[PDB]
């Protein structure tokens, strides 16, 4: 089955940017629930239960009709949160090949940042903002709810391999930021883990 | 211009069921933002800006194409929250004609409550659960984000005249209930304003 992953850090490691109370709730309650609900749906599907979550969400088309929504939502949630935790760290510097590719595809890092903040801010309701690689080009996309670009365009309205992303569900920012999602988005630049983004880019470029 | 309506009650008037800190945030921050953002989008539209919000959300297809989404979202938000506040009150009982109509259409009050609880729990992501008068048979429906059944089926996936509704955006229940939406849904029965519901049912419109 799926399990709630251990984190790369203690819950307080992203202070003073992301609050430690939210980190703990978000991991132990929200993420745990997606794991639990995905596992419940996979119990009757032993041919699907063994797959890594990041692979199963690329294969939702192959599921029985009555399993597609619950696994989209809950396997999407598990995949997305697993990426999110790995994708946060203080003290990194955008550099190297990923920096150059961002400058190439967006014209500058600041142009990219403005585009990413706009996508993150304009996702109305629950969802995620992503930096993806499509082939050879980086792009900013957003998804609804627990959809992922790994699910493809038909399902999610987006596609590409997610280099990094930002959770814009209200549970991710309500305690510290209330409705001020733009303020939360600003703090994300202090904690986006460019080292992990760079490693993912190196594997896929 | 739209304005933030004053509530019919103090922020603690729904205690011990809905918490007064959420009431205050939800009103003064979340609802205010929908007011503000809807007014910004309406300034260039004198022929829509001064209509009641409940009227506006019935003619979204009459807007310029570049205004449809922002006003669906923000006039929806203002309409829905305005209904919600008037749709909460302690010290009401489901009774009279409305009770009889629920029994007629659902078989029993408890069948209605179970169907409402199911719809409210199964709305994945942000949205609302509604009791509507849909060809004046009563029905339970849900909508995404700030959509309303007053917007019609093509836009919202639902239709009918709202009798009452429950906000299931995370901001409505995070502080007290965290991720435990079923517990929040249970508490709603202690605060839904059956007098306002009964008045809306009587009016039908
Ligand atoms: Mn989340
Ligand atoms: Mn709300």
Curated annotation (Swiss-Prot), chains A, B:
Note accompanying the cofactor annotation: Binds 1 Mn(2+) ion per subunit.
Domain of life of the source: Bacteria
Catalytic activity, EC: 1.15.1.1
Binding sites annotated in the UniProt record for Mn(2+): 26, 81, 167, 171
One Gene Ontology term from the biological process aspect of the record: removal of superoxide radicals
Catalytic activity entry: 2 superoxide + 2 H(+) = H2O2 + O2
Record-level GO cellular component terms: cytoplasm; cytosol
Cofactor(s) this protein cannot do without: Mn(2+)
Keywords: Manganese, Metal-binding, Oxidoreductase
Molecular function GO labels: antioxidant activity; DNA binding; manganese ion binding; metal ion binding; protein homodimerization activity; superoxide dismutase activity
Pfam families in the cross-refs: Sod_Fe_C, Sod_Fe_N
InterPro entries (alphabetical): Mn/Fe_SOD (IPR001189), Mn/Fe_SOD_BS (IPR019833), Mn/Fe_SOD_C (IPR019832), Mn/Fe_SOD_N (IPR019831), Mn/Fe_SOD_N_sf (IPR036324), SOD_C_sf (IPR036314)
Quaternary context: Homodimer.
Family: Belongs to the iron/manganese superoxide dismutase family.
Function of the protein: Destroys superoxide anion radicals which are normally produced within the cells and which are toxic to biological systems.
NCBIfam families found in the cross-reference section: PRK10925.1
Protein name: Superoxide dismutase [Mn]
Species of the source: Escherichia coli (strain K12)
């Amino acid at each position: 089955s799926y399990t709630l992953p251990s984190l790369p850090y203690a819950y307080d490691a992203l202070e003073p940017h992301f609050d430690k109370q939210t980190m703990e709730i978000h991991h132990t309650k929200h993420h745990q629930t997606y794991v639990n609900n995905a596992n419940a749906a996979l119990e009757s599907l032993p041919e699907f239960a063994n797959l890594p979550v990041e692979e199963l969400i690329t294969k939702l088309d192959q599921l029985p009709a009555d399993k597609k929504t619950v696994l989209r939502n809950n396997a999407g949630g598990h995949a997305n949160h697993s990426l999110f935790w790995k994708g946060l760290k203080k003290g990194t510097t955008l550099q190297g090949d990923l920096k150059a590719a961002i400058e190439r595809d967006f014209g500058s890092v600041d142009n990219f940042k403005a585009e990413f903040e706009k996508a993150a801010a304009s996702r109305f309701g629950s969802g995620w903002a992503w930096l993806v690689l499509k082939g050879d080009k980086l792009a900013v996309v957003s998804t609804a709810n627990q959809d992922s670009p790994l699910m493809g365009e038909a399902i999610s309205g987006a596609s590409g391999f997610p280099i990094m992303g930002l959770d814009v569900w209200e549970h991710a920012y309500f305690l510290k930021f209330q409705n001020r999602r733009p303020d939360y988005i600003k703090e994300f630049w202090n904690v986006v883990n460019w080292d992990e983004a760079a490693a993912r880019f190196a594997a896929k470029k």
